[PDB]
Amino acid sequence: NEKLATAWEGFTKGDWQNEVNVRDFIQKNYTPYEGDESFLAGATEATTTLWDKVMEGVKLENRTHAPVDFDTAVASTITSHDAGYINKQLEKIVGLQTEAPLKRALIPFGGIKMIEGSCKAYNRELDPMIKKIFTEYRKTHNQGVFDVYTPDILRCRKSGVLTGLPDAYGRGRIIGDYRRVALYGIDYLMKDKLAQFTSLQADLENGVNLEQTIRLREEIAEQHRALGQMKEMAAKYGYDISGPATNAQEAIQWTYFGYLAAVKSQNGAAMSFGRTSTFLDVYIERDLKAGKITEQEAQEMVDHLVMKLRMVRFLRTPEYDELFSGDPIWATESIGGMGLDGRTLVTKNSFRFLNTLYTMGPSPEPNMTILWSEKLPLNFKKFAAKVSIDTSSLQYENDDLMRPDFNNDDYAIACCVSPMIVGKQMQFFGARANLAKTMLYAINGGVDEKLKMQVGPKSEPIKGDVLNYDEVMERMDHFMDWLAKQYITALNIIHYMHDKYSYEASLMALHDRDVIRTMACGIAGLSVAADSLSAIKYAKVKPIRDEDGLAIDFEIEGEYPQFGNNDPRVDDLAVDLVERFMKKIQKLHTYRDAIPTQSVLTITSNVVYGK
Template sequence: MKNYYDGDIARSPRIARLIEDLYDHLPVIEAERAVILTESYQETEGEPVIIRRGKAFEKICHELPITIRPGELVVGSNTKTARGCQVFPEYSFEWLEAEFDTVEKRSADPFYISDETKEQLHEVYKYWKGKTTSELATSYMAEETLRAMEHNIFTPGNYFYNGIGHFTVKYEEVLESGFEGIIEKAEKELHRLKVSDEDYQKRSSFLKAAIMSCQAAIDYAHRYALLAASEAEKCKDEVRKKELLQIAANCARVPGRPATSFYEACQSFWFVQMLLQTESSGHSISPGRFDQYMYPYYEADMKAGKITREFAQELMDCIWVKLNDLNKCRDAGSAEGFAGYSLFQNLIAGGQDAEGNDVTNDLSFMCIEASMHEQLPAPSLSVRVWNGTPDEFLIKAAKLTRTGIGLPAYYNDEVIIPAMMSRGVSLEDARTYNIIGCVEPQAHGKTDGWHDAAFFNMLRPLELVFSSGFELGEQVGPRTADIAGMKSFDEFYDAYKEQMEYFIGLMVNADNSIDVAHAERCPLPFQSSMIDDCIGRGKSLQEGGAVYNFTGPQGFGIANAADSLYAVKKLVFEDKKLTLEEFKEALDDNFGKGISPQRVEELTARIAEQLGRAGVQAGENEIAVIAKTVRETPVPAEKQEKYDRLLQWIDELPKYGNDIEWLDMFARDVAYTYTKPLEKYRNPRGGQYQAGLYPVSANVPLGAQTGATPDGRLANTPIADGVGPVQGKDVSGPTATANSVARLDHFIASNGTLFNQKFHPSALSGIEGLTKFVSLIRGFFDQKGMHMQFNVVSRETLLDAQAHPENYKTLVVRVAGYSALFTTLSRSLQDDIINRTMQTF
């Protein structure tokens, strides 16, 4: 195959300036959208909610301030400042109001917020009390669900506090037909309805809201046409004046009408992407197969001599910069789990068409080149790999990996396509899949996947096996058998499965409650107008309008859970080196390495209770003294010696991740304790639950809420990320680790799996290093692994960046299913990346 494009065009000075402007200030929280939205809601009281949403979006498109940043070729920004963010009070607001005075100083993803903005938002929030989706969702949740969330068994934060994301719309339809074409389609459906139809009220309201929203997007673009023309009139620089006039012409045409050139297609794409983010605060709104739906416009312009490859590349580079301009503010806890200001906008290149032919093209290579030029976190570039993928394309992708920015991620068609088909997706739709957010596959333009619907910590149910479901004075989980009476590992493992199934059911209750709340309070007509078959069904996406409807919460901690359960099996039941009660005591005492906060609280409560029975009532000051004493009381020397011996025994056991087949198969069975029970559940949109196995970066903050575990992991330390082994426990090289991970059942985890590896830069040096690297990927995929992603950066560089962040402002690393600027991450997440095993060939 011809190597279409191999990096003969460098980053232009324009792109360098645009990137510099992105990062010369702290991101800013702006209030305009919240104010406009609230005014609209106050004006539409009593109207159907879908109409209110359409009118609110229309008002936002008409009144939100617009700006053209210096030097831009592709325009459209929902904030006045670069990397600023709007807020979305219809979903939740209490967390931001509580953080007004701390959001600028927090360790993860700080934002500047002015006193004026605080005052504006404080007034806005008065209206929204009792009206948010998060409040309604909470009211729907069962009492035991809320208790489980309080005890950090799982967290459904994505959609609990934010809008719906994790989707890819039909960008190609907007490019081919324009919003005028979508409006015409919706009007035809509206005219088919009869007022006597049983669902006329709902269908007609949705279609009217969709039409209203599409027209609002056209109006928004026309505002930019006028602004560009106005700026051109005042511009003294003839080169820039010509650029502004072309921008004005583009915005006057698209996205209202079909794109007639690659430049118009780029502008049309961007308006869609940016306005989707403006309608809803949901992240992972992913561009999908950009190289496929944009290629006809590029090819036609190239054949007609209307564009050069250099200018086409610069337009793409401009889009890559704009993707980094979009931003959102999360609560402090979520910011720790999604650190790096990421919006997870996944753009994927390569792969097959609906007939199974490889469709790698010139733009596929140029997507990689754009990320080489930018050296920025967004988009989350991915590549599809199958046995028809050209070697030239993988070598090009490997060269990008070698730069150290953690891009691209690699996905295996040979696993993902059949995994999707097992969930009811047609062969044709599965073959044209794209990735959403971190690692989640879906049929683009037809799916409401609710990916990332919750994070489920597989270690917390294991903790509760040791206490028969009891924790901190509450019966949190089922009252499983007392460990003192367990005679076999099977009894222990069955108790773990019982705890797992119970909490999976509660997680489903939480997700379904949130799902219903979004349908009732925040349907999204603009988003829904571009996903099949919402217009045909007369339903928003949130009401089940998509062809494919899923809910995809992810479990994480497989490596720790597998190593922990094996340690119990081997040390307690096979070698009989200690009892379960002795193991529990060691875990409660954190192996003597500093008592955990949970244990401090438990022992303090127990002592206060004993004092109460003796007639001594402990007040707040007395409780604080007791807690301080508990924290500072050292473990007796004899007990510490016993704990150190236990840690040595654990350390000597074989560990998942070292190509030990029987242990890897045990880990596969442990993963089934999450993936199999989840399959039986359905969501309110009529779709199936499907498991993912990845933590994003939540393995660090949620590990901080987890006690010590039998694999020797200390309390409140990170949990293993993704489906890879525990940090530092994979000691047999990258191929052995890949062999182990491949033995998990990636087909059942159809919501995605995540496999991180870290290489020293020397491992990918020269063509020999690149060739070995590509062979590793193909070998892992031949064994039916689903996904791989890489950090290529030395430990020394990361440690120096941690110590001297001012020297590494543009250092990008792979965090989880996304890349981020290293210096913007929390210290704990930086440490987690530093401590990942460094591989070499």
């Protein structure tokens, strides 16, 4: 139409011009780079003054072991907060979660009891109103879940067999395609969602999957709505993103706004930023080959961009705060990799992103993992190696396994869960089922002796001396049957509720209509379970019981292979264990039919050429 023309200028025509197909875009006109870091540009006085200003707050957090500041009366949404800056006139890319830098907000939808816990712990008071609103009017995810939980699930939760269950707040391991905002503009994305909404009208009237169709429709309505609040939010910062980004600054700013909306409305742990570097590099490259921008100017926008990314915070409590234990924010950016066609996806921008670890120093948070492949440009390989040595801040993943695995070169990383083709997959974060604890309970009739609690079904402890691997596994297998039911039942409830009371509209609005859902399951204490199993069949494992007969400790006469030592008879037990569980799980009904998956253990065949 009107806008498209002005801003699409120079871009090699392709499907991405007809349907939301970011992937085709990038592939159609991005510039693979084999050069080296020489072209790089250093920091800026603005960038440095800004970073130092922020650093103040960080130092304050470390020293305090608490948030700089957080709301106690405002319920965050995409548009609840006014614009907020570190230094208006100094920022090239703008946008914060609240009005003040590092000031954490209240995102009540996940659960109110958590917010109370935060207020309590960091010694402040929750505005009685906010509590009333999310107790009597708007039910929270947390509350909804616990209303449906079974006594047994609660019981498993207490013992630890099931752990890390996202039932108190954001489940989030969702990667919305934020590049869309930039590449298409809100208006185009909103019209698209209307076509999606309308495409469901036949099924609705025909009664084909009635209730699921009604749900998908309401969800899309909310997506639409969210996209609209996105413009409102951006507007508060003097920007109108209704149309597609024109220059490299808007491209970056748009993409970030899409993410800012996510970070203002949801509080999940692994809301990856996605695969952006290369995408944005087509906008930067363009403005360079035209004289509109300067390489140092570019670097500066990137520096301000990741700077914000370093600033995203979430109000937690001591336990869950990234400080003590607590999973960190996982704004992950996947870099480089190779396209299915063989060309590398490494771009100038790739170097630019890594460069931020120099310009603004080393930082873990804008968690940048490299999509490593044996065929990445050497200069790039070397640089990463250099950067890693100097900042020890980069992460890596084998692109040579994933690319061919998904048969897609546009996937992104999401922490502690399988990768996802951006905008095409939705992954329900399951937590972890502890197979180590499961094994012990199996041995002890379902009881947790170090707690004197009957967790699983009542059965007889393993009698006799010197544990017999065959018997132990027989017991362990029947117990894994039970555990599979508890675990999947929990996840079924958790995600039904999270979809109802905390639908990630702003992010789902940046996914296709029908996304592939999977129940990302996880396992805890696998190595410990494998070792214990090993010892049982390669040594004299004399159980050491007590008054009641419960295995309290274990004597091992002999030697056995340990986990992490590439020895098959253990790595085999580990593998066996995993598949046994997943096989058990996969026989059960899962909410919305998301297929159970796992990423704790991957198996494969790879040819290594020597000489």
